[PDB]
């Protein structure tokens, strides 16, 4: 049963057979098989084109992960929370971190669920932490210089150093047990409670018309105002948001009618359970059949139509019903499942590349997965800075990575422990590159901890340019370590 | 034939004979043979006198370079740009590129001629590219902050990355074929056409006393009211100033009289072609005879005398002729040669000393040759920035080295293919340093591409200081690679 | 008869015995035996605690070294020099350097005096040179931008480069001879004379109550005024300052009363010689029994109490004696020995750490010893720059390291050569790291030499941030070299 990275050590006429025979080149989840497409569908001379296509597909996957997280996931989370009298400023402080970190969390959950991929998770978390700490944070200060707040900055930097060293030592021990995962989650809860307490202490001291209007993702008057590049971005994003509108119900506590799109919501009482059934566990639970007569999706459709008609004729178009808030929960489920789905695909693609090019999980994680997971950070935070809120963006840039690392490691490892019934997740370090990654994260934190106070919390262009050059040097060292040029 | 360092070890009786008969020691560039003058003309006991005289001569050469750049070269470039209404980007990409890039092209042509030193020619071009994109560009932004033009900068940086990656791939294949050389030249012609077209679209959318006064480098009014130090500097500067006034014409647009000296310019109309001939290849075409009856220098003298008489009789003192600005072109040529000439002897001095102090060919190859080729870039660009044209100099730093790489590689390999009657040029990477140079060039281009837009094209001293630190780190990696601390 | 470094390969039940028997674990000075404490007086399970303790002890010693140097050594030096009426320009130039560099000088003296520790000296004198040039100098520009003076800067940078190249070539040759050490000291004298001449040419062109008060290290008004952190630092420094007030006399020419605390100084006529005889050579000369009846300390006490009684009964309260300045000499001498004593302990601790973890002398010297020796630099220079004198701080930052390296190497090696009656001091190589350190010092000097003129001597935040990032990269390369990731 040869390790199926040996596939390039074979004659091209045997490749497909190897892929079909070796269970090590089969995945546990997803819909497409990418090694099979590499070696069977495409002809051997057309290898580069295929891989080029794959990168494009991978990039498009990130786009989905961004949109779903920002327009459909966090709004419904906010609706659920604000149905329970929550505050305003910490809402902006922390929900920005949640929306920026959802892709990171779901990617870590997917990667930790398989020993062949767990390395990706670590590389993708630490890697993102480096990027956001240098390129995004520095970038903010180049776009608008501002004055940071001393106490929040020092609080965040301390908590994040603590989390980095906890993961550093868990990596040295080579494993992470149930108590460690529970400790990570508890430490995150402690951090949020501290934020709340300290803020308090600082302060004291026809219907078819609305179907069409509800399924239209364009605003033409705004669309003509934009530039050529933004128009191209919008036409790229059109199909994704059309599907998300079709399947995910959204509730805004802001708008007066709360997005009560009566007929679209009545249809989504049918559509959303189907996408949920066909998405959970890649649909394995879907073709499940009660008594060998009818599958799951049939009874789902029957009950869905019943409830959809019942609600359709029982409510008024201008007036939402009394159980309207429940839709947010539904919209929180289906959206999350969409994110999970896309995350699965991303991870599968990365695994495939590692087989074809014999690249480690750590390099793939800290480059491709990190950059893809941080695209949303860049959009959100640069846009927020250019609008006149660089202080909020800088706070998110250091308070969202804490969420990433703590919740990602804790929850991913906890779910793996529960599912596998084992007693720990094994973190085998992947050679010498993992220590380079950890050292780089520590050193970027040390640079910020010394520099920001010494400027008296007055951040400007020079700080950002220096952080950019730090990232360039870090990539130099990563490249050298991966080519075998530095060894021991 | 022994290595040229060993001449320090031989007996003093026949050191001069060894320097004479060994081809590997005698210089191939300039007008003076310094090794001969240090081992033959001077007694074996007066060597420190030779060393101190050589150092003083080197300092005087730097003075000559400074005066020529400040007084004769940059004024004529400005006159050309003003007369043709060229924008600073176009002026820095077309005219400044050729004058700055002549040494690079000629060195590449020579180096590609030998089948052994083909891959050593690629290293000089990459090294000079790294030096110019970091040190000269950063120095421009430190000495004089300015705002770059966004559209030309993006165009230039994109073309330069394309050319650099194309040379990466040609080096990786290990081969330059005739089709590749023609593709390089075609890409350069395409780039120049694009520059011109885009600029056009944007646009649419008695007499003896004056000979004696004109050839006079002294000003008595200033002379009387100076300090002793400045007086000594002026008297040290006089001979080169006089020769430069004699040989280089200067057109001035800021002057109402236009800086038109009728008899001096008419004489220059035969002096300047003569020096052009005598210092292109040190007069090889000058000594050659056409038809075996009238030699070349006689021909140029005859034609220049005829043209000078025509101009002298067609013009009055007070009003310059209608084609006055063309003198700037002549003044742009000769002065450029004065720079190239001088830079050569600077190099040919250091090399000489390197033999006496016993320095091997380890670092003198790929790093001394880039600095020697970039002396003119530094002088011209820094002078031009300090005079109020940092956009022109910055544009050269990213648009003239496109000329360097494309024309150097394409023309050198095309000439080799033609002469050798072969079909290919073998590029043989020698070790690990060529890939370090390639990676450094690519990474500095990436740094500038991210940084300049993120500053919104307003460049200041922080960007330049980061670029100097980058070059320091590049030298660190180069030294670690040369001593073998970085290996496989 | 193995080396002490083997102690950590024996069985845990024999370690202690080894340290008793092995002569190589015995230090030739000091008062405590740190190896005999880490193996014989502690349980093997709590070895980490001991090391943490040791580090804290180390840190406290550095505190001592600062206080004695700033508050007791330099004041008495000034009181001696004022007998020849020196002005305040010479003061701010050089006395700041003496007070800042005393710990460095005494550490080098202690380290050179033993072939087993002579590496620390080199590592510490170069390492501090790097740190003070990047972190302190850079920091001064971030806290307060200023315009540097050009002539002093060029003079200092030149002299420091010459000193660094001299030490680099002595390290390459592998030994320091008598004439080399005398050349170092003569070159320092030459530099100081040049500073004086250049500044000149520029200038042309009841009783019990006052015992209890004299021994009061607090000014409780200011203590009530200060913040929390300053209060904590003062309560940390209280015992050292109390002991220093008890033992070291002080003469202050600035005050009117001239620091003539009649009864305290008369009592210090007894206290001081006893401290001298007990800290000289760690007390070897103290027990030497003269004539088989009297130890040295006994006759010292008797003669001292005779002089003290005579002086007290022959002196006046508010009028100091005629020979008052003589006290200054005493106060200087005793204070020197305090520094010496503390320095010895530091060196011993570092040696022990090297034995335990098998760390080189160079790495311990360039990290721990250099940081501890530069703490006083940081305090003095940052405080001076925040009060509005950043030119003085910046000048001290480049003229104190010249004193430091020249006097340290010259005087430490000269004393060792005199004592051992040898002809030289060997500079044994600690492998590749020493060349990494020397190259880093040279490269930081080059960065400053190019950058500061290019800014036209107007120094700002960006320069300092780049120097900080340089130091981060340097410590990265050091850390890679120590673990053998880069080797040859
Ligand atoms: Ca993210
Ligand atoms: Ca050039
Ligand atoms: Ca010091």
PDB file of C-alpha atoms and ligand atoms in Angstrom, chain B residues 99-104 132 372-377 404, ligand 2:
ATOM      1  CA  UNK B  99      22.914  57.362 -21.939  1.00  0.00           C
ATOM      2  CA  UNK B 100      22.631  55.554 -18.623  1.00  0.00           C
ATOM      3  CA  UNK B 101      22.536  52.132 -20.248  1.00  0.00           C
ATOM      4  CA  UNK B 102      25.309  52.207 -22.847  1.00  0.00           C
ATOM      5  CA  UNK B 103      27.964  50.637 -20.539  1.00  0.00           C
ATOM      6  CA  UNK B 104      25.579  47.818 -19.585  1.00  0.00           C
ATOM      7  CA  UNK B 132      19.362  50.645  -9.356  1.00  0.00           C
ATOM      8  CA  UNK B 372      31.022  50.149 -12.175  1.00  0.00           C
ATOM      9  CA  UNK B 373      28.125  50.067 -14.622  1.00  0.00           C
ATOM     10  CA  UNK B 374      25.857  52.067 -12.291  1.00  0.00           C
ATOM     11  CA  UNK B 375      28.238  54.937 -11.479  1.00  0.00           C
ATOM     12  CA  UNK B 376      26.687  57.011 -14.258  1.00  0.00           C
ATOM     13  CA  UNK B 377      23.170  56.128 -13.098  1.00  0.00           C
ATOM     14  CA  UNK B 404      19.335  47.264 -20.251  1.00  0.00           C
TER      15      UNK B 404
HETATM   16 CA1  LIG D   2      24.360  52.234 -16.247  1.00  0.00          CA
END
